[PDB]
Amino acid sequence: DDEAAELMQQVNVLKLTVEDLEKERDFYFGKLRNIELICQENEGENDPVLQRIVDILYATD
Amino acid sequence: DDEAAELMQQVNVLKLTVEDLEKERDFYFGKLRNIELICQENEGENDPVLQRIVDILYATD
């Protein structure tokens, strides 16, 4: 009685959590992609500020 | 036998998924915050390109 019900509730909770995180992850990622394009389109400016933004975008750690 | 075991496996899978998404969500979010600061520090430039980046950062949809 207990065990299966407890796990089913946990699954439901984790499913809602994953859905919210997925949407947030995609929302933020979308912004980064839009920003990456803006930087790319203006590479001809030789702007040090965009270089900083570019380096942030491509950083691994 | 089946039910409880099936749900326990699903929980384990969802836990791993949430952990990965959380780290990705935070990774991307961190970049956006760093970029927001770069834009803020250079607001005195009146640069239309940074205005575009700022508007992307603050967009809701």
Side-chain angles (χ1 to χ4, degrees):
Chain A
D1 194 61
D2 284 298
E3 190 60 53
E6 294 294 299
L7 296 168
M8 185 172 284
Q9 178 54 55
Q10 181 165 31
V11 167
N12 289 340
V13 166
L14 291 169
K15 280 184 178 182
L16 299 174
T17 304
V18 302
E19 275 170 40
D20 294 328
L21 286 177
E22 197 278 0
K23 296 171 187 174
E24 294 184 59
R25 187 283 301 284
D26 297 340
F27 182 56
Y28 297 152
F29 185 70
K31 295 183 182 294
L32 292 173
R33 301 277 255 188
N34 290 311
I35 294 173
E36 173 182 48
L37 174 68
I38 289 178
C39 290
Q40 286 171 159
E41 299 183 306
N42 290 282
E43 294 176 304
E45 292 189 306
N46 298 157
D47 184 1
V49 180
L50 299 185
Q51 183 62 47
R52 286 183 181 291
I53 292 177
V54 163
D55 294 327
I56 284 179
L57 288 174
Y58 301 152
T60 62
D61 301 4
Chain B
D1 194 61
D2 284 298
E3 190 60 53
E6 294 294 299
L7 296 168
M8 185 172 284
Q9 178 54 55
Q10 181 165 31
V11 167
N12 289 340
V13 166
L14 291 169
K15 280 184 178 182
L16 299 174
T17 304
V18 302
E19 275 170 40
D20 294 328
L21 286 177
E22 197 278 0
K23 296 171 187 174
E24 294 184 59
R25 187 283 301 284
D26 297 340
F27 182 56
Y28 297 152
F29 185 70
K31 295 183 182 294
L32 292 173
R33 301 277 255 188
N34 290 311
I35 294 173
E36 173 182 48
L37 174 68
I38 289 178
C39 290
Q40 286 171 159
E41 299 183 306
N42 290 282
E43 294 176 304
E45 292 189 306
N46 298 157
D47 184 1
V49 180
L50 299 185
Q51 183 62 47
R52 286 183 181 291
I53 292 177
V54 163
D55 294 327
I56 284 179
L57 288 174
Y58 301 152
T60 62
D61 301 4

